[PDB]
Structures are given as structure tokens and as C-alpha cells.
Write a protein that binds this ligand. Structure first.
Ligand code: HHH
Ligand code: CO
Length: 346
């Protein structure tokens, strides 16, 4: 198959609170809805991000048990492919858990579902790639916009960061490589004080689905990833990164709409000009927005984390601008997790 993100589905306790949190704080548009005897859902749209929010209204629906375990979270990273039956057959033969066999399932395109990490799944969606399309079963239109968007301009999803139980990284990397044709593109041993993490990035052959997989290092003290695993009650999506053309301007625009970003101390910006010589922003700009700067063989990388507004403080989001950077960088990653540590330990 040749995987693109069709949509990301989150399971939610409260549809109207979640939908308008994305509309109001992040400038998503409402695109479509889907309802049955067991759920109500909305499809939200901005740039190339399609977010689906689903609230179960019956204990039949798998979200009821998910919400009881996790609170709100990502449940399905759905992938567009040209031949779903082929992609499924090959994935299952290579080891994928079969969750639902290819079929209509609603005048729908052909759809199937396989397992992913933890309890997150992947719906495979048949698309010929000629156009933006609503998730299957949804009525509405993809030609929608939020005219109150102002200066916020989220372009797409850059990657998903995922927390795994210790000892699960190596085998989850291998699963994505064998079942789905993903490749290992980056890896990083992360240290924050006396805690550490192991991480490996797998990415679909198309470039379009990236997962930054992280497990606790059992040789160091327990920290952030252990906390996530305990509070979430399992492996899961820790953050989603959204692309922008200009991270400084996105932080400003999102801040005004109510989004709180993590703080990075002035010491970091003092140390900076000796580490990297900036190419698209001023050191002043970065300092003011707590945006982090690093570099790849390919160019520069600007990233920032959002403070979690989840009741368990689990999932959070990231704004990322790539100026030729193709992967990630040690200094950004160390600083991102040090922002997290600062927020949570003080
Ligand atoms: O946003 C990041 O930098 C984070 O998702 C990440 C974690 C581990 C890694 O190897 C690369 C990136
Ligand atoms: Co990230």
C-alpha cells in the first residue's frame, strides 16, 4: 500500500466540548457528522488535518471501554491506500492483528482495520488520491473553512509521538517495518536529569505517516514516559505534531486563542547562538514564544509543546516548522522533554 493519513480519530467524553475546543482554540472547521444508534461523531478540518471526534452513546461502541480506561485520546490513525484488500492481506500475513476485514460497511469506499500499538488501531481506507474526501459514513463537505482563523494556519500532521511500555520499542518497530513497510529513519537515547528514554522513529514508505516511538530506559530512574503509561493506563499517543510555515507566528496566534505553551528558561536562549546560527527567525522572536531551534543534515527545525489540558494530563500537542529539516534533532528533543519536566516537577 502507499499510506497517507486519511484522518485521526479521538474518542471523547463530551462531543460538544471537544469539537468547540478544536474550533475555538485551534481554528478547525466543522466538515461533517456521523451518527448511529451507538455514537455521535464530527469530522473537523484544517489544511490537510482531518480530526474525527467520536462520543459513544451505547456500551456496544468500543469507545465506552476506551474512555473508561484512558479518558479522551487517540483511538484510530486511519490510513488512505489505493488497494485496501491487498494492504490488509499482506499486513495480516506479516503479523498484523486483524480487527476488521475489508468490506463496504456503510455507499462507502472499501474499508478494513488492523491493530497498531496498545489499543490504537489503523483503519485502512480505499482512496485513488484524486481529492480531499470525508471519512466514510459522514455527511457534509470538505469545502469548509473557519473565517475566524486569523493568523493560525496548521498545514497537516507531521508526526505522532507514542509512549510504549519498557521492552516494547524493538518489537513495535519491527511490526511497523514488516506488516506495513515502514522504515526506521531516526533514533535517540534521551536523558533528562536521572531519567532516560529510548526512542526510534518509523515512517511509511510514502513519507506521510511518522511515529516517534518512545519507551522508558529501565537503566535510569522512572520519569515522564512512566507517568504517561501509569496515568493513560497503557501505551498510547502522547502528542500529535502539526506543521506550520512559521512556528513563531503560530505560537502568537494560538496563544491569543487560549492555548498555553510550555516555558523554556532564558539560560537556553543564552546558550543558543554558540550552538546554532539561525536562518529564518530572530533569537528575540524565539525567546518571546519559547520556540526551540535545532538542525538536521537537511536544514532547520523549530518545535514547541503545548501544556496538556487533558484531565489526566496525558496527551498534548506540538507546533513544528521545518525549514529543510527532514527528521529531528537531539537538542530540540532534549529541550522539549526538559520543558515537560519543568512543567510537571517545577
Ligand atoms: O517531537 C519530537 O521531537 C519527539 O516527538 C521525538 C521523540 C523521539 C525521537 O527520536 C524523535 C522525536
Ligand atoms: Co514531537
Amino acid at each position: 500500500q502507499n499510506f497517507e493519513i486519511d484522518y485521526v480519530e479521538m474518542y471523547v467524553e463530551n462531543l460538544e466540548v471537544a469539537a468547540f475546543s478544536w474550533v475555538d482554540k485551534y481554528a478547525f472547521a466543522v466538515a461533517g457528522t456521523s451518527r448511529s444508534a451507538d455514537h455521535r461523531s464530527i469530522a473537523l478540518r484544517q489544511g490537510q488535518v482531518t480530526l474525527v471526534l467520536t462520543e459513544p452513546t451505547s456500551d456496544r461502541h468500543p469507545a465506552a471501554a476506551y474512555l473508561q480506561t484512558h479518558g479522551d485520546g487517540v483511538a484510530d490513525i486511519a490510513m488512505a491506500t489505493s488497494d485496501v484488500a491487498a494492504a490488509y492481506e499482506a499486513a495480516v500475513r506479516a503479523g498484523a492483528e486483524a480487527v476488521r476485514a475489508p468490506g463496504q460497511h456503510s455507499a462507502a469506499v472499501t474499508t478494513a482495520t488492523i491493530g497498531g500499538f496498545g489499543d490504537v488501531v489503523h483503519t485502512l481506507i480505499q482512496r485513488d488520491g484524486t481529492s480531499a474526501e470525508l471519512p466514510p459514513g459522514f455527511t457534509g463537505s470538505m469545502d469548509v473553512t473557519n473565517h475566524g482563523k486569523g493568523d493560525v494556519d496548521l498545514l497537516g500532521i507531521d508526526h505522532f509521538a507514542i509512549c510504549l511500555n519498557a521492552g516494547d520499542l524493538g518489537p513495535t518497530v519491527e511490526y511497523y517495518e514488516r506488516a506495513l513497510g515502514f522504515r526506521q529513519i531516526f533514533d535517540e537515547h534521551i536523558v533528562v536529569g536521572a531519567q532516560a528514554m529510548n526512542s526510534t522513529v518509523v515512517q511509511s514508505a510514502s513519507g506521510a505517516v511518522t511515529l516517534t516511538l518512545i519507551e522508558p530506559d529501565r537503566n535510569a530512574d522512572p520519569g515522564q514516559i512512566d507517568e504517561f503509561l501509569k496515568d493513560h493506563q497503557g501505551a498510547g499517543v502522547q502528542h500529535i505534531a502539526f506543521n506550520s510555515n512559521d512556528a513563531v507566528r503560530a505560537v502568537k496566534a494560538l496563544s491569543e486563542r487560549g492555548v498555553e505553551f510550555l516555558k523554556t528558561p532564558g539560560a537556553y536562549y543564552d546558550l543558543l547562538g554558540e550552538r546554532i546560527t539561525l536562518q529564518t527567525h530572530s533569537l528575540d522572536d524565539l525567546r518571546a514564544t519559547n520556540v526551540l531551534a535545532d538542525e538536521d543534515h537537511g536544514g532547520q527545525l523549530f518545535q514547541i509543546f503545548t501544556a496538556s489540558t487533558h484531565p489526566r494530563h496525558t496527551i498534548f500537542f506540538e507546533v513544528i516548522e521545518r525549514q529543510g529539516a527532514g527528521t529531528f534533532g537531539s537538542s530540540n528533543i532534549k529541550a522539549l522533554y526538559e520543558a515537560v519536566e519543568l512543567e510537571r516537577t517545577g
